[PDB]
Amino acid sequence: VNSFSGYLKLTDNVYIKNADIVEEAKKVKPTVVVNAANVYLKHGGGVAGALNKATNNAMQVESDDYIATNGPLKVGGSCVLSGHNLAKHCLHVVGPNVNKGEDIQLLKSAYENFNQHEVLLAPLLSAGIFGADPIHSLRVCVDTVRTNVYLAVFDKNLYDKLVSSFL
Numbered sequence: 001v002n003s004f005s006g007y008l009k010l011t012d013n014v015y016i017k018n019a020d021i022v023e024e025a026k027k028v029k030p031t032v033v034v035n036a037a038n039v040y041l042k043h044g045g046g047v048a049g050a051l052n053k054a055t056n057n058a059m060q061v062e063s064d065d066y067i068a069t070n071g072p073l074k075v076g077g078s079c080v081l082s083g084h085n086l087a088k089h090c091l092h093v094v095g096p097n098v099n100k101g102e103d104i105q106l107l108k109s110a111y112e113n114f115n116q117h118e119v120l121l122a123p124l125l126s127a128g129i130f131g132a133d134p135i136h137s138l139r140v141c142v143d144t145v146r147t148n149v150y151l152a153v154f155d156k157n158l159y160d161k162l163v164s165s166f167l
């Protein structure tokens with residue numbers, strides 16, 4: 001038994017809810033929240049900017065130090081940093097950005113990072129401003145992630161479409 005409430009069970013291990021992932025992170029304080037990162041960890045908008053704003057920019061300050069030391073992530077890759085006031089840890093995962101021409105086949109690699117964590121609160125990778133089809137992102141998630149993943153979908157319209165079209 002864990003602290004996640006109001007989710008709808010899609011599979012043995014994947015759960016989904018209509019909620020802002022930022023708001024969800026503040027209530028639950030999960031062990032791991034996933035950020036929809038880019039390779040530079042520049043958290044300007046979307047999930048990353050909303051998460052970063054909720055940390056009062058501390059996520060960005062930590063991220064800038066991480067990049068100064070390590071250089072950019074890979075598309076499909078991740079790093080574990082602090083969860084600040086939102087979670088114990090933030091898993092920054094880089095899905096391919098379709099609006100930059102990145103290989104959608106990298107979405108599976110991106111979701112494989114989730115398997116290193118027993119339980120996660122996450123958004124749909126490569127959805128929103130990253131330009132991928134969220135229906136596709138949910139299919140890759142279900143077919144790739146084996147650990148317990150609690151997906152937050154902010155758009156109520158999209159949430160209902162994801163559920164009603166789920167195979």
Ligand SMILES: CS(=O)(=O)Nc1ccc(C(=O)O)cc1
Pocket residue numbers: 020021022046047050051123127128129153154155
């Ligand atoms: C409402 S918020 O901007 O504070 N935080 C969010 C939540 C979800 C998304 C998304 O694209 O799914 C983007 C930002």
